[PDB]
Chain length 457, copies 3
Amino acid sequence: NLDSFFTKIYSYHQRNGFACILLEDVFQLGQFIFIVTFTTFLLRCVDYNVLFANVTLSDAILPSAQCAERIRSSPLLVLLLVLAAGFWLVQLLRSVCNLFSYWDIQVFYREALHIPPEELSSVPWAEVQSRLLALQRSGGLCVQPRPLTELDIHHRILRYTNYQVALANKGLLPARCPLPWGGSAAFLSRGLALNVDLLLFRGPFSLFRGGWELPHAYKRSDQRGALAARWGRTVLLLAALNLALSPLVLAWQVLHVFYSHVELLRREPGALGARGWSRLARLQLRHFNELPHELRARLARAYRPAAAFLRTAAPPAPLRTLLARQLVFFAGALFAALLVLTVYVLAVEHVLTAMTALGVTATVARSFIPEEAPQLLLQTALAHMHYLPGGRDRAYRQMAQLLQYRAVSLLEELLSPLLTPLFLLFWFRPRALEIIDFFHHFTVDVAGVGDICSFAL
Amino acid sequence: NLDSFFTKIYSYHQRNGFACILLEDVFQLGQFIFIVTFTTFLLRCVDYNVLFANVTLSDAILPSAQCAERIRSSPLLVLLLVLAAGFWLVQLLRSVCNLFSYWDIQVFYREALHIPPEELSSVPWAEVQSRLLALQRSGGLCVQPRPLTELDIHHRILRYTNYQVALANKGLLPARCPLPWGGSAAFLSRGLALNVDLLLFRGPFSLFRGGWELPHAYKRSDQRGALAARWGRTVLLLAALNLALSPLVLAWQVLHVFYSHVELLRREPGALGARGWSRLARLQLRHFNELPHELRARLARAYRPAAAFLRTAAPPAPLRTLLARQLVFFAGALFAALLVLTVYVLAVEHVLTAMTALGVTATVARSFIPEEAPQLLLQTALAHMHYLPGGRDRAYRQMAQLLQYRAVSLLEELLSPLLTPLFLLFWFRPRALEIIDFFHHFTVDVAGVGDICSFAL
Amino acid sequence: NLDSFFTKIYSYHQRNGFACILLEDVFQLGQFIFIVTFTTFLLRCVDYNVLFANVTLSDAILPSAQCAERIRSSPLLVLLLVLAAGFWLVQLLRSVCNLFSYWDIQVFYREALHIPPEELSSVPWAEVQSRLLALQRSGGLCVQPRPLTELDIHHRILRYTNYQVALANKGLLPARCPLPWGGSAAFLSRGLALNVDLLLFRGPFSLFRGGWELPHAYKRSDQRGALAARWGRTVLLLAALNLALSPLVLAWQVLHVFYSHVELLRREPGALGARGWSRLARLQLRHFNELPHELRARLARAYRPAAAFLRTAAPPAPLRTLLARQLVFFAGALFAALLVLTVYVLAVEHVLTAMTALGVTATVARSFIPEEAPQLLLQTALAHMHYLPGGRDRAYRQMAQLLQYRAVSLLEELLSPLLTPLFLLFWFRPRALEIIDFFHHFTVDVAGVGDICSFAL
């Protein structure tokens, strides 16, 4: 695959180390096996009877034979374990193939250009482009008679991103299910994006089988209805497969988010209260022919002014402030009485029960209440915002939508498995013809590179 | 009352919602009833004998009959409760009158100008003035043949603030009892302000009976001595009344400040260490014909440079910091020994007693010690302060006086009931003739509006 | 001593108060007596038997006679105590001499210039110079026929600092023992500075006996070998003395740093993680003829931009952050399991043992991991840095070396007693002729002032 070569030469530098990639892979596999074995051990070896005393943990550990009969007790866990083992095996094989390819890629990189591994981090990736250009000037490889230039190098790596950006600009990709009382909703979890990628670009059932070029069948105008019907049955079967596979990935996501959330639960909610970017922003804010690293730099430099503009010109709300004041005072009065009682015997056994709950109410109330130039912040934010999707109300709502809250995004990820087939069935199938029309009328064929969207030029 | 109409049309917008006013009032009444009932319940239903164990709280609750004899046991509590009920019902009746008036005020507002309740928050109150102007141009009401101008609208609402600002800039209002060693003290608690308001502007014994016009009796030059004698009698009887009523309001203030302080006691003293504005600043630093909202906005904008100037250019103190260093080292050494003893049995039962005290000493010592352009901060503060009451020492002392500490202000509020009659007797009575002369020679009469201080123009 | 007069007149103002100096000294004496008595009391009066219960502390205190035979039990403690008492007596006598001289100089200061003690903090020390100049104009003292100028006044106080700055600029003074794998090491603990001061400038064995003029013997070219041999035997005997005295000063430093560290141990490591200046910076960054207060002010203003430049342009570390991510994820998983086990009996007695360790590992992992214009910061730092000792790698390494870590400096101070004779033996003795030549060829004699280094002019 011609595109895969450039994609891998980019990914090697972007992962700044071959050993880094190897460690990433091996420790990802070790991760997955750690979660599976630790969950099955906690659910299949831990005996609550001895622990609850209703003592050294080694003594509390039941003998291995008892674990043998206890794991024999249920057959469903055996099927779960064998499925997990098969998944681990297939990912292991794919990863071995990937690292086997990448080592030879790095060997070719060293032979062609001879940059030592310790010097890779110092290179700003512009000299990589310059060295590749000089390689074409010296005729290292016969990659077309006309030497490759910057636009072609960018296109051969970013064709799929260009199509996805154009399709999102048209407005079809972001889910826009109508809210009952009024408003627009957005749903761009990793599950939906993966489904779109498997449906459109990569895979055996993809329209772009291999992604080299658009097949001639879709150029014909008359066969569009038959091709739309074929796509309809394809999306129906894909939705059926996703619905079949939903519960297992749901459980996996539940375990992973449980670990991630309880890691931060002990820590202060300040990190939990922070807000990062969302995938909708990473989709609607990507210029044509743009690498991921430049996008990351732009959002990194635009993070602070956007946050300042968000927290400076928030719309006022009197009723919320009044209610917060009354709740915080009542919580404070109850805490006053309770603490005065507590200070002067430790054997109450009932006060300490409500102490934590009342303190939690006080802490949420204190942070919920508000306390004591929007135009300049908006201007300096838009200086890096570049594109953009009561005027102040609309602007604040849009800025809030483009920059979601962390727990909101995690809840979106958690709810993705259940919503995986529903949106595919309800939002894509009825509007089938116009997407095929968009591919038909917005594709441009060029010599050498091949298929490029008209919106890229 | 002509002034009351404009005052209420201002207050409706400033409370940004009729439902907001209704909820605030009803929940303030619920506030007071909750405080009284909870205090009397804790004093007359809590049984320390069973709770101290010398267990579910519901079991600890004594039967209602026993509470009946216990509340019957003392007659003083009955008088306290009946007085509280009388105060509650009087305030209830006043509040019902206020909300009944305000509902028809809002109805008239809707009929005249037709702004829905949701759109009130969006209006910057300038369009309110413009619409009222257009109403005069369209002849909505026959409020004098000459249409009302902006200065007149401001004056009819702000006459009392103008008089109070003039009287404060004369130097009479802020009580300035001399310190024994030296210096000037300022006392402007809410109690003294309420006393001045009840004496001068609002009430049956006020000089301004109704606040419409100055009575012609005070214009005569020959009667000034008799009028001063009458004012002396009035201030004596007012001081007697306030001295009679002092203990009950003192107890109420004690309860309220107890709740407020213990609400923040568990939280970090960072909020307790915060600095807020004082009423003396809100009186001396207020221009003529000035609305409360613009003053609040100006002080909100000027808050931060004032704090920066206060912290940057603090006067040096060698002896203070050196003694602080000694105390912090001694506390640290004692903490060292005590912790080393503690880490290696939990049954010491005497170490934990000194634990908290020594920790508190360490925490106060560490925060009390000092650690590593004043002109620019002073300039940017004075650019917003507009007015202003070793040069650096004098400037810093004035900036500290105009911006008090939170606990200092709360202590002033708590000490107000005892200080209520003392200052009225010792500070106002001897210098009555000059106050009478100030009212005599600083009032200018104009057509339509009426009585205006010469310092307003 | 002519120089001592100006040195004391500077130190009086720099310590901003005679009473301050007197109390600081008497509290330093009480300081040392407190450490010695408290340490010997804890080691020779505390009975672990009764306290461990294997109760009021007063009951736990053994009788005085018991402490009598318990201190009689071992003989070396008596020698330690008598040596400490003699050391305290020596410092007490020296301190009495210093305060006796300082009262006399303060009396002369009042008689000649008449500034009250309260006004000393107000003067910026420039008026002190002006008043002294006026004193020579009026002929108060016959200090040479030619009136004293600013340069001469600065030299008579800063001759030793000038020589030390020249020596450090030559590169000899800071020890630069070579690392085994490679790199440069710096060691400028107070012990080495005291040794070089006692060997070069102040002391009976100093080359500058009294610090008034350089002896004529060192000017002769032919005697340099014999003088170098004398210096070599002197450094050998000095190293022998320091090696003999090493253990006691080591123990004293251990006790002092123990108290200092355990004072901050309970507090958050934010103060422990703070960055402070190092003596190497205070040595290489000092211009010729600069007083200590000017240097302190310069670094006070340059502290912040240097810190910003340090935290902004840190070199990337892929392997470090990847390992940190893996460790923090594993620690979080173990913390998850431990916490969910703990939430639902307090009689476990084994989980709580690893609770603190696992939490500490999680905290160090989260603190260690990295998270999301260097040229401007470097420029604004160099604007105040004036002098200066992959270009970015070299610049960051220099900025890191020039500004050490706090705990690193304390560890350097702790390790100084063991390294005290080793560097003096290994680094100074072989290079003796070159240092003798350095004094010989860069000493300039001037009328009145006397000896000034060639690099001062």
